[PDB]
């Protein structure tokens, strides 16, 4: 049917270095088309440019209106910023890959709300995109670990790392529509909208060690903010399990020791700056 | 020897049930005290009255105060309601059942906190009481399911009822002396204090109908509360795997129907349906 095949709608190293995958592998600049987020400056920043990108590689920027009647065109969001209809579409091949382990932490901000949420392990999952937010079918998931002292920004660094890998691991078989899939369960579904969390997070004391490094490290992520303990930004957050007694708070130029109801030593480290 | 060799302290068919097993198979009213709750007025209503049973028994009523200095006394704390400070006990034969699965759960309210966390079970544990809340080091525990339409209500007698069983199954072995304990973990600690639960929940509905379906249920607790929806008290939620559509609220004379972002159905059911 159209020459157009694909379109990459989103942001970041995981659309463009899948963006690129395509290129090199399955289709053509005149096959492809691209929606970039409202946001992309076309430059690179502390990510690559989507829109950088595809300029640089002769591929036509486009809107979603200018997509929605090509017949049989594969649509993938990679971090893109429109929640898409499913009825403006000719095609039923559209597909995201959700930085969670769905059906847990639906929505948005998904590198501090696993954190700050106690888990000890996320993923990336590639689904279907129906009407909902991350609500479609599952076609593969990768789950990965939180290590004990990951921030969100070593926790986004891992949706981008695991996301491109599931991208790569999946794109043929959705090219060829030779894909399973299977619905989400409602048990264990949870979704965060942004007024659900404030990101400038005051922490609560009266809470286990583990407790309050998590509510530490979910927010340290420095191209957003650090959260801020008596007006020093903390960089980092070490939780060990050495007892130092309940409910320690000490001040120190360089960094804080805290414990909770616990009793567990944290490390908040100072911003050197 | 002392005369008293043990202390039932705190409240609920748990101590009172305890209380009676420890009567019929290890001692007599005479070795016996108990420290009721403060708020144990002698009256058996939802729950028997530990101050009840101690009185119909003739088992003496007494304070901390009046155990600290008793050598070896096995003190055993369920439900009960003052935090103790271990240093004043001549003994360290300090035990309490933690309504949780330990380390989770720390704290009070843990019929409420499991559920509003989306848990899928919870947990009695037998524990050694230390300076901290629920901090000890764990004897023993049982976990078992928060079957999905159950509400905190539904939890506690749960709790009550796997709790009084962990007593009974580690109670030769405390008064041995020959129990087994293992330090609490760092990791998947969690704690709530009173100011963290609001008792009068206001729900989010913009969520998955597993949690608007978690945040009613969690309240359900009729002779303290009930969650309420648009000016009626709510007494039982039932979530289903049915898809209705997205964000569906409607009221109804005797219930809602209700769906959160993905879309499952929930039924409501008001306290006033006959
Ligand atoms: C904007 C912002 C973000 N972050 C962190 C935490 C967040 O998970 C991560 C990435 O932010 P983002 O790129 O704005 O996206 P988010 O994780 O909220 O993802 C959501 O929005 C994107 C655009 C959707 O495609 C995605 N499916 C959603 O989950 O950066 C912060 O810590 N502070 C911020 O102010
Ligand atoms: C006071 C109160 C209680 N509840 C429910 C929720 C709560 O988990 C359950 C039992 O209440 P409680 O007997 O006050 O005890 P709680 O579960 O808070 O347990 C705490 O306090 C008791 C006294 C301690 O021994 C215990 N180790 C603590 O966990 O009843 C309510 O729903 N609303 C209330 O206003
Ligand atoms: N239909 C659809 N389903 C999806 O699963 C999906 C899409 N489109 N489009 C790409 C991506 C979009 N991700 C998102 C997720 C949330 C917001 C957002 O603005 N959320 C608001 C709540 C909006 C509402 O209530 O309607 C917020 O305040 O959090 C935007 C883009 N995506 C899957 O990743
Ligand atoms: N030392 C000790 N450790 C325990 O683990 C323990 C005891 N005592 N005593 C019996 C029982 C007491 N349980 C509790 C738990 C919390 C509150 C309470 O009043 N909590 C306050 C916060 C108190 C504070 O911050 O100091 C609240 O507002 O939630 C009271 C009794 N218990 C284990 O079951
Ligand atoms: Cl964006
Ligand atoms: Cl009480």
Same mark, same amino acid.
């Given at each position: 049917?159209?020459?157009?095949?694909?379109? !990459?709608?989103?942001?970041?190293?995981?659309?463009?270095?899948?963006?690129? /995958? &395509?290129?090199?592998?399955?289709?053509?600049?005149?096959?492809?088309?691209?929606?970039?987020?409202?946001?992309?400056?076309?430059?690179?920043?502390?990510?690559?440019?989507?829109?950088?990108?595809?300029?640089?590689?002769?591929?036509? &920027?486009?809107?979603?209106?200018?997509?929605?009647?090509?017949?049989?065109?594969?649509?993938?969001?990679?971090?893109? @910023?429109?929640?898409?209809? !499913?009825?403006?579409?000719?095609?039923?091949?559209?597909?995201?890959?959700?930085?969670?382990?769905?059906?847990?932490?639906?929505?948005?901000?998904?590198?501090?709300?696993?954190?700050?949420?106690?888990?000890?392990?996320?993923?990336?999952?590639?689904?279907?995109?129906?009407?909902?937010?991350?609500?479609?079918?599952?076609?593969?998931?990768?789950?990965?670990?939180?290590?004990?002292?990951?921030?969100?920004?070593?926790?986004? /660094?891992?949706?981008?790392?695991?996301?491109?890998?599931?991208?790569?691991?999946?794109?043929?078989?959705?090219?060829?529509?030779?894909?399973?899939?299977?619905?989400?369960?409602?048990?264990?579904?949870?979704?965060?909208?942004?007024? @659900?969390?404030?990101?400038?997070?005051?922490?609560?004391?009266?809470?286990?060690? /583990?407790?309050?490094?998590?509510?530490?490290?979910?927010?340290?992520?420095?191209?957003?903010?650090?959260?801020?303990?008596?007006?020093?930004?903390?960089?980092?957050?070490?939780?060990?399990?050495?007892?130092?007694?309940?409910?320690?708070?000490?001040?120190?130029?360089?960094? /804080?020791?805290?414990?909770?109801?616990?009793?567990?030593?944290?490390?908040?480290?100072?911003?050197?700056?």
């Amino acid at each position: 049917g159209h020459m157009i095949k694909i379109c !990459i709608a989103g942001k970041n190293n995981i659309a463009v270095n899948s963006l690129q /995958f &395509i290129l090199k592998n399955y289709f053509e600049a005149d096959q492809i088309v691209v929606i970039p987020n409202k946001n992309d400056k076309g430059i690179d920043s502390w990510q690559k440019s989507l829109l950088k990108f595809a300029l640089d590689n002769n591929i036509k &920027i486009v809107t979603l209106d200018e997509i929605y009647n090509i017949e049989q065109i594969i649509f993938f969001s990679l971090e893109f @910023d429109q929640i898409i209809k !499913i009825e403006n579409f000719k095609s039923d091949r559209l597909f995201n890959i959700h930085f969670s382990a769905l059906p847990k932490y639906k929505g948005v901000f998904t590198s501090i709300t696993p954190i700050l949420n106690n888990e000890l392990e996320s993923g990336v999952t590639l689904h279907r995109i129906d009407n909902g937010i991350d609500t479609g079918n599952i076609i593969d998931q990768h789950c990965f670990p939180i290590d004990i002292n990951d921030t969100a920004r070593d926790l986004y /660094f891992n949706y981008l790392k695991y996301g491109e890998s599931i991208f790569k691991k999946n794109i043929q078989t959705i090219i060829n529509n030779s894909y399973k899939d299977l619905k989400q369960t409602n048990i264990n579904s949870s979704y965060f909208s942004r007024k @659900d969390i404030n990101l400038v997070h005051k922490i609560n004391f009266k809470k286990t060690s /583990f407790e309050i490094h998590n509510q530490i490290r979910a927010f340290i992520f420095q191209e957003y903010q650090l959260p801020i303990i008596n007006n020093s930004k903390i960089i980092k957050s070490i939780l060990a399990n050495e007892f130092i007694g309940y409910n320690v708070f000490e001040e120190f130029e360089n960094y /804080f020791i805290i414990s909770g109801i616990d009793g567990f030593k944290i490390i908040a480290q100072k911003l050197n700056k």
